[PDB]
Structure 1
Amino acid sequence: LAFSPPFYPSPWANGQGEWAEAYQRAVAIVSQMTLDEKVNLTTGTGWELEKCVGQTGGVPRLNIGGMCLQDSPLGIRDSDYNSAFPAGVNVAATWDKNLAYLRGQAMGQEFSDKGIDVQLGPAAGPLGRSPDGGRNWEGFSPDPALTGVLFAETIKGIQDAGVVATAKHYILNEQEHFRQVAEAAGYGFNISDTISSNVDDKTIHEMYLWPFADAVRAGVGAIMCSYNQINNSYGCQNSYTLNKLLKAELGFQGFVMSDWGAHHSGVGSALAGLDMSMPGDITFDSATSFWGTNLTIAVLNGTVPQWRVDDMAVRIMAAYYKVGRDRLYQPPNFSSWTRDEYGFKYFYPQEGPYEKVNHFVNVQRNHSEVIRKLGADSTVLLKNNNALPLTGKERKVAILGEDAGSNSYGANGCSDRGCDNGTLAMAWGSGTAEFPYLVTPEQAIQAEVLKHKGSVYAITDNWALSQVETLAKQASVSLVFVNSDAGEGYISVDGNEGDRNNLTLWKNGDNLIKAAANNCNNTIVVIHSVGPVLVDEWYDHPNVTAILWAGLPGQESGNSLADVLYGRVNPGAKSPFTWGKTREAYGDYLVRELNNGNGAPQDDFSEGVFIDYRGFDKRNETPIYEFGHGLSYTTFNYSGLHIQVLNAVATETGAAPTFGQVGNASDYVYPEGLTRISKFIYPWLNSTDLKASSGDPYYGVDTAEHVPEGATDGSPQPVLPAGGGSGGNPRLYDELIRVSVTVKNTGRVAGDAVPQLYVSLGGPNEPKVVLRKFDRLTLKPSEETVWTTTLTRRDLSNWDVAAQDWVITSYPKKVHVGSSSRQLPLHAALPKVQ
């Protein structure tokens, strides 16, 4: 079975780069803390004990409030009077770094104004190994360059607004099936441990880790480690991914929190690089914790060195100061668990003072404008045979499909969005937010037609095909709406257990399209979905005149779409994934049956880097719509490619420090006047008897044997060749080549172009092309601009597993510029650089 080699000790923070000041503040305050106060920072107080989906007790003596951590990557979860933004996948489809940053800033403002200190997002894991993976839509794209850049921009927007971002899920959580043992048991599968992603060192560097390097370099405060194992070591105690790749190689200076239920040991996780246990207990409301009391005990008995617990506290305070949270701090002014104004302070056991728990604070500002704009700018025009924009003069408009209409239970009427009813503007699970309202395509399109005194109707029952065909025969245009949904694995809709069982349109969508196209020669298809779907049955029908993919647009969905359909916005989005003729074309099958008896299912990533377009290109398959494809209401020309060569670090760490002092066990015993709330997790001991206060059946059992070599080594360490900076050795970001090309609007309408720069790194098992740069450029008709970008040393390297470093290989490299991964009219060889 795959095996995860040890890497110890767990690197200590050092004030690297832009963390100098936050680190000095953190050391100064942690140096004042007792051991129990430090432990409080690292451990949540139990599921549903306080207001936020994760919450720590904070350090009241030093006026540090409990940290409130709240989902989701697209808007505040489980709250009120908040906005519901488009999903991460729509941000990918914009190809627009500025919109990514502005959506991060608008979310950070809302989370800040609710008294939330840490936003649980954004997401770049799953990256998107499989097109049917249940959570790809929360992240960005299966391409690491596109994802890393928009991931980083989103982080900077949230943290500039004063909230810590959490880069998740770290790492290789590429499918929902078998991700948690009790979830799997619920679905009838008996496994002893969760699915193991087994992946080689070059692929993890070149694909899945890459956006995390960009997140670290962009200054992300927190990372959330994942439910799956990696080579049979759980993501929240994997010393290789946490200590070696994230902390020593990427130089991460912030803190690592568990996913909820992803914490699986006290000592082992602390030594392997975990910094924060969420929601704090071992299982929800177990009234036990791997940390809390156990972690205080593990320091007192000598098993976890004081320097490791002090380092967890320093990384957590440093991230909090780095974004300035101390300057915006207020307790969370809502409850995740009830919308009542008043209630008991500690929700789950219904204890504590009875007081106000919701303040109904409206934090939306005018964030509907950026939502509406980002929905329009993420609507990919896949096909258009001179059918769009509509003019408003269409005499009779048929709006066809459940996906145009309202959810009959209300927009929020399925818990955690766990149904696919009405228009799909948000997929399901914890990566969700309550809509303040949802504008449906039916509403926005009917309103548009009425403003023009047209005739218009909506049919939203996709087995009402008699009515559909009769109306389509009468209509000037039939706008047909179809979807395909997915979400986190704890919810199953129609047997889809988070992951999609297929890539086919849900609710009879292929048959609805055929019924309309059979009868109307101007049938336009709009798809809302979490990822690609199969369009082969109808995309080339002679009466399917246009096809758009609008993703999961959030609360302004119908307006975003009407702006594009009626030409107020010229669509500039480009597909952030491949649209294949079949499911087999994408390869990368999910693991859906037990393949390791009743042990952890094994998920070998045997395709290596060959996911999405890299796989299609390697197998010489032709997508229907390739990665980077999107049409516009204007045309653009690329000309004049030029390349210019440009003229372009500690070897050991310090010893591990300690901050403040640890005293006797009696200093950490529960304080005499404190009422202990049922199920609440505390840092304190029942008595000075360590074994009895731990309640651990394995307390003191063969301890040395279970402490890996190097795990308590506080001496100076070697800096790895690929380490020593933020996101990797700083030499990786030297700029080696400047590339320029002229882009011109050759059409009659102002529009944005998304020029794309791919490289071919050369060599027998490298992808033919890999994206490296892009931008989104607004041009008036006939306007030209010179698009200039640079390739860094990292952009031209491959990961060399013998060197443990990035290397520019001797194969000749080329650059290619154009409008998609398959439309690259300009190509230049690159000169040898190093």
Structure 2
Amino acid sequence: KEIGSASVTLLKNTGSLPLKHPQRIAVLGNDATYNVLGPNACGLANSACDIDNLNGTLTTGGGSGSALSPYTITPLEALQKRAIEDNAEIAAVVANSNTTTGAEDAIAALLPDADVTFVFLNRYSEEGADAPDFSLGGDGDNLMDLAVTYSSNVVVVIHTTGVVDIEKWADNPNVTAILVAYLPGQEAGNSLVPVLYGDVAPSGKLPWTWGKSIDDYVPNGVVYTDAYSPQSNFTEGVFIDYRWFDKMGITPRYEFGFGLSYTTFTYSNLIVDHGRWAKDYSSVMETAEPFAEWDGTNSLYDVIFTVFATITNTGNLTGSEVAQLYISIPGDNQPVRQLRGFDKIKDLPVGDSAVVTFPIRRKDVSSWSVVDQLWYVPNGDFLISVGGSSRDLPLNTTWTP
């Protein structure tokens, strides 16, 4: 559960979250409730259910990295627990909205009087095939169209195996909040509702880039060919995800390492401490990785320096903050920046400050010599940037060894 509550990521919030004590709650989407055939209906690999089946809350993906469930704690059941505590009413349409007789009529009638409308969306994928685009699973496009027609307070919650296309509605003023919650396992619903009701502020951030379009990603991501010897050439090199997005100058929807809270954090007092170094003595096994500065005592993974910064909860509510550190290694055709540290502060009171610390190892500031076939620390001007996301970096400094 605590994993779910720490992961769930807030992408948009025009004022609707956290919920106070809404009296009339509307829920949309089979994602909000059980698989109609049972949590384990899809079998040993969570891939045997029909393509149109209502599989319910998307708690894991398809294939060999799935597992059986003792139960699922559905969002609806958890939302209901909370409604009942508030002496409120709650109603869910969980059928296929396109194919079920009266579904659309029901939604039209249910939503206008709701204080808030949740829409649960999912996007299953699996081992054995690739997603054909950023397409919402089942009836999700429809759900969303209906929802914004009849309600001005839609809160979208996505259970997905990756980025999905929400371009149609993400800038609709009627969509007041959007959250992704990934694949939260069995404690799906009870990990989420605390966040929505504001018992714990959301603290999770995107572990990849949310581009406005599949066309903004590394070309030829999937090659389709009947050719007896199929060929993908990684001609983009090191430039995947936000590295690609950064180098090409492409603004995504939501950047790598982005995710809102219910409060704001102000960054301050950047500090690089050259005296804060230490030898790697802890790791279980060692590589035979070659590097310039090697002298028979030392390591690629020695922490050469350490960098510090200060966050201040400048908001109105307690909240956790994932601080990120990026470095610009100099060189030719070198990423605009690369993440070389993160430190999550837990539950920072309003007005309070905490120090963020980042141990930079040697390898963290090195390049591969193609010619000499070793790791070496380049010369040049290293940019160090610290902040909230891969594009929210209010503190830079420069280092030159």
Given the two structures, how large is their TM-score scaled by the length of structure 1? 0.44
State which of 793, 805, 811 in structure 1 corresponds to 2:380: 811
Alignment partner, residue 421 of structure 1: 55
The CA distance in 2 between the partners of 1:470 and 1:722, in whole Å, is 68
Query: 1:654-691 deviations in whole A, cap 9, x for unaligned?
Result: xxxxxxxxxxxxxxxxxxxxxxxxxxxxxxxxxxxxxx
- Asked if 1:563 is matched to 2:194, the reply is yes
Given the superposition, is the C-alpha separation of residues 720 and 641 from structure 1 closer, same or farther in structure 2, using an over 3 Å criterion?
closer
8 A contact 1:510–1:538 mirrored in 2: no
* Aligned-pair CA distance for 1:467: 2.0
- For residues 247 and 361 of structure 2, what CA distance do their matches in structure 1 show? 25
What displacement does 1:720 show?
A: 6.1
1:443 aligns with 2:77: yes
Aligned to 2:363: 794
2:5 is matched with 376
How many angstroms apart in 2 are the aligned matches of 1:439 and 1:449? 16
How far 1:730 sits from its partner (Å)? Answer: 5.0
- Offset of 1:588 from its aligned partner? 4.0
- Among 607, 623, 644, the alignment partner of 2:236 is 607
The aligned counterpart of 2:209 is 578
3-state secondary structure, aligned to 1:628: coil
C-alpha distance in structure 2 between counterparts of 1:784 and 1:622, whole Å: 31
Change (3 A) 1:765 1:477: same
Q: Is residue 465–residue 512 contact of structure 1 (8 Å, CA) maintained in 2?
A: no
Q: Distance in 2 between matches of 1:404 and 1:507?
A: 13
Higher strand residue share: 2
Task: State the partner residue of 1:114.
Answer: none
User: Structure 1 pair 455/609, CA: closer, same or farther in 2 (3 Å)?
Assistant: same
Once the 2 structures are TM-superposed, how far is the Cα of residue 531 of structure 1 from its aligned partner? 1.1
Aligned to 1:594: 225
Q: Which residue of 2 aligns with 1:831?
A: 400
Q: How many Å separate the matches in 1 of 2:161 and 2:263?
A: 28
The answer as to 2:94 corresponding to 1:465 is no
Deviation at 1:826, TM superposition (A): 0.4
Secondary structure at the residue paired with 2:187? Answer: helix
Equivalent residue, structure 1, for 2:36: 408
1:514-553 paired onto structure 2 within 5 Å: 514-553=145-184
Q: What is the one-letter code of the residue matched to 1:576?
A: P
Match of 1:616 among 222, 229, 245: 245
Give the letter for the 2:87 counterpart.
Answer: K
2:268 aligned partner = 639
1:430 — aligned with what? 64
1:329-408 alignment, distance < 5 Å: 372-392=1-21, 394-408=22-36
Contact 2:220–2:232 (Cα < 8 Å) also in 1 = no
Separation in 1, partners of 2:57, 2:290: 51
Please tell me whether Structure 1 or Structure 2 has the larger radius of gyration of its CA atoms. Answer: 1
Match of 2:119 in 1: 480
Unpaired segments ≥5 residues, structure 1:
1-371, 490-497, 649-718
Matches within 5 A, 1:664-679: none
Partner Cα separation in structure 2 for residue 518 and residue 808 of structure 1: 57
For 2:125 and 2:298, locate their aligned partners in 1 and report how far apart those are by CA, in whole Å. Answer: 39
Report if aligned partners of 1:376, 1:571 keep a CA contact under 8 Å in 2: yes
Counterpart code for 2:150 = N
Match for residue 765 of structure 1 among 323, 333, 342: 333
- Please state whether the residue corresponding to 1:554 is helix, strand or coil: coil
Whole-Å Cα distance in 2 between the matches of residues 801 and 630 of structure 1?
37
Per-residue Cα deviation, 1:694-725 (whole angstroms, up to 9, x for no partner)? xxxxxxxxxxxxxxxxxxxxxxxxx66359x9
Write out aligned runs for 1:215-254 (5 A).
none
SS of match in other structure, 2:56: coil
- Shift in Å, 1:763: 2.5
Q: Contact 2:58/2:124 (CA < 8 Å) preserved in 1?
A: yes
**Cα distance, 1:769 vs structure 2:** 1.1
Q: Which residue of 1 aligns with 2:281?
A: none
Q: CA deviation at 1:591?
A: 3.5
CA contact (8 A) 1:762 1:768 kept: no
Could you say what the CA RMSD is over the residues aligned between the two structures, in angstroms?
A: 1.8
Question: C-alpha separation between the residues in 2 aligned to 1:379 and 1:798?
Answer: 35
User: How does 1:44-59 map onto structure 2 within 5 Å?
Assistant: none
**CA distance in 1: counterparts of 2:357 and 2:289, whole angstroms:** 33
Residue 469 of structure 1 deviates from its aligned partner by: 2.5
- Aligned partner of 1:626 in structure 2 is 255
The equivalent residue for 2:282 is none
The one-letter code of the counterpart of 2:152 is N
Partner of residue 284, structure 2: none
Equivalent in the alignment of 2:389: 820
The offset of 1:453, in angstroms, is 1.2
| Contact 2:223 2:231 (8 Å CA) reproduced | no
Query: Alpha-carbon deviation of 1:563?
Result: 1.3
Please name the residue that 1:698 is paired with. Answer: none
Alignment counterpart, residue 453 of structure 1, candidates 80, 83, 87:
87
For 1:824 and 1:537, locate their aligned partners in 2 and report how far apart those are by CA, in whole Å: 29
Match of 1:322 in 2: none
Question: In 2, distance between residues paired with 1:730 and 1:454?
Answer: 64
Provide the C-alpha distance between the structure 1 equivalents of 2:221 and 2:242, rounded to a whole number of angstroms: 18
Which secondary structure state, in structure 2, belongs to the residue aligned with residue 433 of structure 1? coil
1:750 aligns with 2:318: yes
| Secondary structure of the corresponding residue to residue 375 of structure 1 | helix
Q: Indicate the percent of aligned positions where both proteins have the same amino acid.
A: 43
Counterpart in 1 of 2:303? 735
How does the TM-score come out when normalised to structure 2? 0.90
Shift of 1:571: 0.6
- With over 3 angstroms needed to count, the CA separation of the structure-2 counterparts of 1:511 and 1:801, relative to structure 1, is same
Deviation at 1:451, TM superposition (A): 1.7
Task: Describe the superposition over 1:559-586 as per-residue Cα deviations: whole angstroms up to 9, x where unpaired.
Answer: 1111111112211001111111111111
Aligned equivalents of 2:246, 2:383: Cα separation in 1: 16
SS at 1:472 equivalent: helix
1:61-95 superposed Cα distances (whole Å, 9 cap, x missing partner): xxxxxxxxxxxxxxxxxxxxxxxxxxxxxxxxxxx
SS state at 1:642 partner: strand
Tell me the CA shift for residue 601 of structure 1. 1.6
How many Å apart are 1:612 and its aligned residue? 0.9
SS at match of 2:232: strand
Cα offsets for 1:292-336 (capped at 9, x unmatched): xxxxxxxxxxxxxxxxxxxxxxxxxxxxxxxxxxxxxxxxxxxxx
Q: Distance in 2 between matches of 1:642 and 1:721?
A: 30
| One-letter amino acid matched to 1:537 | K
Cα offset for 1:485?
A: 1.1
Query: Alpha-carbon deviations, 1:247-291, whole Å to 9, x = none?
Result: xxxxxxxxxxxxxxxxxxxxxxxxxxxxxxxxxxxxxxxxxxxxx
Number of matched pairs: 376
